[PDB]
Amino acid sequence: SYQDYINCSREALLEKMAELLPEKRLTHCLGVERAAMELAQRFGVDVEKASLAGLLHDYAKKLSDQEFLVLIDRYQLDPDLKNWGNNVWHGMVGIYKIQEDLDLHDSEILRAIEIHTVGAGQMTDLDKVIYVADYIEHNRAFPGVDVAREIASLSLNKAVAYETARTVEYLAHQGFPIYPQTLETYNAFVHYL
Amino acid sequence: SYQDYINCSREALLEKMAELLPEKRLTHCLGVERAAMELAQRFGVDVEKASLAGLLHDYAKKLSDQEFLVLIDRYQLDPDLKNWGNNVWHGMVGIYKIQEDLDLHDSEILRAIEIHTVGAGQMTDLDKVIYVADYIEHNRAFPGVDVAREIASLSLNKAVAYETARTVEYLAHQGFPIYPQTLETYNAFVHYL
Numbered sequence: 001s002y003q004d005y006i007n008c009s010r011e012a013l014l015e016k017m018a019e020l021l022p023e024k025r026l027t028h029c030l031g032v033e034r035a036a037m038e039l040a041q042r043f044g045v046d047v048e049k050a051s052l053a054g055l056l057h058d059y060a061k062k063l064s065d066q067e068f069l070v071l072i073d074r075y076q077l078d079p080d081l082k083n084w085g086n087n088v089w090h091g092m093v094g095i096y097k098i099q100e101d102l103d104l105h106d107s108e109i110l111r112a113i114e115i116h117t118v119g120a121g122q123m124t125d126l127d128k129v130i131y132v133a134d135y136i137e138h139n140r141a142f143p144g145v146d147v148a149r150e151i152a153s154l155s156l157n158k159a160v161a162y163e164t165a166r167t168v169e170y171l172a173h174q175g176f177p178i179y180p181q182t183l184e185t186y187n188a189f190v191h192y193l
Numbered sequence: 194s195y196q197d198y199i200n201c202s203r204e205a206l207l208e209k210m211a212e213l214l215p216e217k218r219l220t221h222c223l224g225v226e227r228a229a230m231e232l233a234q235r236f237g238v239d240v241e242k243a244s245l246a247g248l249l250h251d252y253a254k255k256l257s258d259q260e261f262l263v264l265i266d267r268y269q270l271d272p273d274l275k276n277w278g279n280n281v282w283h284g285m286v287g288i289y290k291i292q293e294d295l296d297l298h299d300s301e302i303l304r305a306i307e308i309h310t311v312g313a314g315q316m317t318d319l320d321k322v323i324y325v326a327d328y329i330e331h332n333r334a335f336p337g338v339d340v341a342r343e344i345a346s347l348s349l350n351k352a353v354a355y356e357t358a359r360t361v362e363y364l365a366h367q368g369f370p371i372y373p374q375t376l377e378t379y380n381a382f383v384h385y386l
C-alpha cells in the first residue's frame with residue numbers, strides 16, 4: 001500500500017493534493033500514476049513504487065520561489081540552484097517538501113521524482129519510467145505524443161531519448177535556458193534514437 | 194600585413210589552403226574573411242586580426258581523425274576530446290595544426306579559431322566576430338540566414354545568441370550529440386534574444 005512509503009492512505013494523499021494543486025495538475029498526476037504503472041509492468045519495475053512516484057512527481061509544482069529558496073538553504077543544496085526557477089526546482093528541490101509533508105524516505109522514489117524534469121546521465125529503470133510516464137500520460141495531447149507513446153510501447157531508453165531530444169529542441173526554439181543536467185541526459189541517451 | 198602573424202603572405206596562404214581544402218570550403222573561408230572584416234569594423238575589433246582569423250578558421254577542416262587524435266596526445270589536451278569528432282576538433286584541436294604550419298602565436302586569433310564552432314560562456318569581441326561571420330558569410334543561403342544578417346547588422350551579442358539557439362535546436366532536431374561547451378555558450382547568451 002502507499003502507507004508503506006508515506007504517512008497517509010492514497011485517499012488522504014489525493015485530498016492533500018487537491019488542496020495543493022489546480023484540477024488540471026491533479027488530473028495530470030493521476031494520469032502519470034496510471035501511465036507509470038503500465039510502463040513499470042512492461043519494463044520490470046516495481047509497479048507500486050512507479051504508481052506512487054508518478055502520482056507524487058508534480059506534488060511541489062505550486063510551491064513559491066521563496067519556499068524553494070528556503071529549502072535550498074535549509075538542506076544546503078547546490079547554490080547554483082538559486083540561478084534557476086520552478087521548472088528545475090519542483091523536482092530537484094520539491095523532493096524535500098514531499099519528504100517533509102509525507103515522511104517519504106524511499107531513495108529510489110525520491111530520486112525518480114528528483115530528476116523527472118531534467119533526467120541524468122545515469123537513470124534507474126524507475127527514473128526512466130517516471131520521466132517517460134510524465135510525457136505520455138493519457139491527458140496530454142501535444143503534437144507528436146502519439147510517436148512518444150509508440151516508442152514507449154517498445155523501448156524505455158528510446159522513449160527517454162525521444163523526450164529529451166524534443167525538450168532540448170523546444171527550449172532552444174523558444175530561447176529558454178537549458179539546465180546543464182538536461183544536456184547530460186540528452187548526450188547519454190541520444191544514441192538510442 | 195598577414196606576415197605580421199603567420200610565416201607567409203596572404204597569397205602564399207591561399208595557395209597552401211587551396212591544397213588543403215575543396216573549393217567550396219576555400220570560397221567559404223574567403224567569405225568569412227570578408228564578413229569578419231565588415232563585422233570587426235562595425236563593432237570595434239581589429240579588422241586585420243578578424244580578417245585573418247576568418248580566413249583561417251576552417252583551415253584544419255579536412256584533417257583526419259588520426260591526426261587530431263595525434264594532436265590531442267602531443268599537446269596533452271582534454272582526454273574527453275577523443276569521445277567527439279571533426280565538428281569539435283577542427284577548431285578546438287585544429288588550432289595546433291595552424292600553429293605548426295603557419296607559426297601563428299597570437300593568442301586572440303588562436304582563441305577565436307579555437308571556439309568558432311562551440312563558442313564559450315565568455316567570448317572576446319573578436320571571438321564573437323568570427324563565430325558570427327562564419328554563419329552570415331555571403332556564400333551561405335540556409336533558411337533564416339537573412340534574419341542572422343539583420344541581427345548581426347545591429348548586435349554582435351544577439352547574433353551570437355541567435356546562431357547558438359539555432360544550432361542547439363537543429364542538433365536536437367537531428368538527434369546529434371551536443372558538445373557541453375556549446376550549451377555554456379547558449380545559456381550565457383540566450384538572454385540577448
Ligand SMILES: O=c1ccn([C@@H]2O[C@H](COP(=O)(O)O)[C@@H](O)[C@H]2O)c(=O)[nH]1
Nearest residue numbers: 087088116117118134167177178179182
Ligand atoms: O532543462 C529543462 C527541462 C525542462 N524544462 C521545462 O520545464 C517544464 C517542466 O518539465 P516537466 O517537469 O513537465 O517535465 C517543461 O515544460 C520543460 O519545457 C526546462 O525549463 N529546463
Ligand SMILES: O=c1ccn([C@@H]2O[C@H](COP(=O)(O)O)[C@@H](O)[C@H]2O)c(=O)[nH]1
Nearest residue numbers: 280281309310311327360370371372375
Ligand atoms: O556543439 C556543436 C556545435 C556545432 N556542431 C556542428 O558542427 C558543425 C561545424 O560547425 P561550424 O564550425 O561550421 O560552426 C556545424 O554544422 C554544427 O551543426 C556540433 O556538432 N556540435
Ligand SMILES: [Fe+3]
Nearest residue numbers: 057058116117
Ligand atoms: Fe514536473
Ligand SMILES: [Fe+3]
Nearest residue numbers: 028057058134
Ligand atoms: Fe508532470
Ligand SMILES: [Fe+3]
Nearest residue numbers: 250251309310
Ligand atoms: Fe568550422
Ligand SMILES: [Fe+3]
Nearest residue numbers: 221250251327
Ligand atoms: Fe566555417
